[PDB]
Design an enzyme around this catalytic site. Structure first.
Site, PDB file in Angstrom:
ATOM      1  N   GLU A 116     -12.731 -31.205  -1.985  1.00  0.00           N
ATOM      2  CA  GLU A 116     -11.802 -32.294  -2.234  1.00  0.00           C
ATOM      3  C   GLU A 116     -10.994 -32.472  -0.958  1.00  0.00           C
ATOM      4  OE1 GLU A 116      -9.108 -31.718  -5.504  1.00  0.00           O
ATOM      5  OE2 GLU A 116      -8.180 -33.687  -5.261  1.00  0.00           O
ATOM      6  N   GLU A 202       0.246 -39.194  -7.404  1.00  0.00           N
ATOM      7  CA  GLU A 202       0.372 -38.077  -8.349  1.00  0.00           C
ATOM      8  C   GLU A 202       1.853 -37.821  -8.618  1.00  0.00           C
ATOM      9  OE1 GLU A 202      -1.884 -35.034  -6.049  1.00  0.00           O
ATOM     10  OE2 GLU A 202      -3.235 -34.967  -7.781  1.00  0.00           O
TER      11      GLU A 202
END
Length: 221
Positions: A116, A202
């Site tokens: 990621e 986020e």
């Protein structure tokens, strides 16, 4: 909140080759809600917003509302550039959150992620990335921004997070420069497939918050 917004946990909208996901995956870790909407799509550029209030679970991400590009997974070898532009701003109080690209690499086109790779345009209110050591592994300058690079595990996936030294509300560059950096400096295989290109936020905690994305575009050549 607009009546045109979508507030469901897994709700989506579509604009051009983008999917805007609500992806309120960490819902249960706190108290609050989050609503999202597309504002315009012109040429290849999307404008959108997401509003939220989240409390509790201070270290737990509540969601990743993001615009995701539909594209054919491509080996890093075969990518010439990933031009991108992103203009945004945050309003609200006590905002602990990031604004970040989220990308993934796999051994096959539709495979499980080996890496990621995040690029954080903002780390607000003390929000921080996954880190094995708690310190940077590198401090490179890429795409007109000075970055703090961190790495840490998420099970069988290694997470690299480039965090901007300063909040960057207007960003532009070749996102492939980040992959090239990791290929040259962190032993990432250039035969891996880029499977995912997402750009969103986020949230951890905050009140009466709103991310306004005035301009976003990305493409792969």
């Amino acid at each position: 909140q607009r009546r045109s917004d979508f507030c469901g946990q897994w709700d989506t909208a579509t604009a051009g080759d983008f999917t805007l996901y609500n992806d309120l995956w960490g819902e249960s870790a706190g108290t609050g809600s989050q609503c999202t909407g597309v504002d315009s799509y012109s040429g290849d550029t999307i404008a959108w917003h997401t509003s939220w209030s989240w409390s509790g679970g201070s270290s737990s991400v509540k969601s990743y509302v993001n615009a995701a590009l539909t594209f054919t997974p491509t080996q890093l070898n075969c990518i010439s550039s990933i031009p991108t532009t992103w203009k945004w701003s945050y309003s609200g109080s006590s905002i602990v959150a990031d604004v970040a690209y989220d990308t993934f690499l796999a051994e096959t086109a539709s495979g499980s992620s080996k890496y990621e790779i995040m690029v954080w345009l903002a780390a607000l209110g003390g929000a921080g990335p996954i880190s094995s050591t708690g310190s940077t592994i590198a401090t490179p300058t890429i795409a007109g921004v000075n970055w703090k690079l961190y790495s840490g595990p998420n099970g069988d996936t290694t997470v690299y997070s480039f965090v901007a030294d300063s909040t960057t509300e207007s960003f532009s560059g070749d996102l492939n420069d980040f992959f090239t950096y990791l290929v040259d400096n962190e032993g990432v295989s250039d035969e891996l497939y880029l499977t995912t290109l997402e750009a969103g936020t986020e949230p951890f905690t905050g009140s009466n918050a709103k991310l306004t994305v005035s301009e976003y575009s990305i493409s792969i050549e």
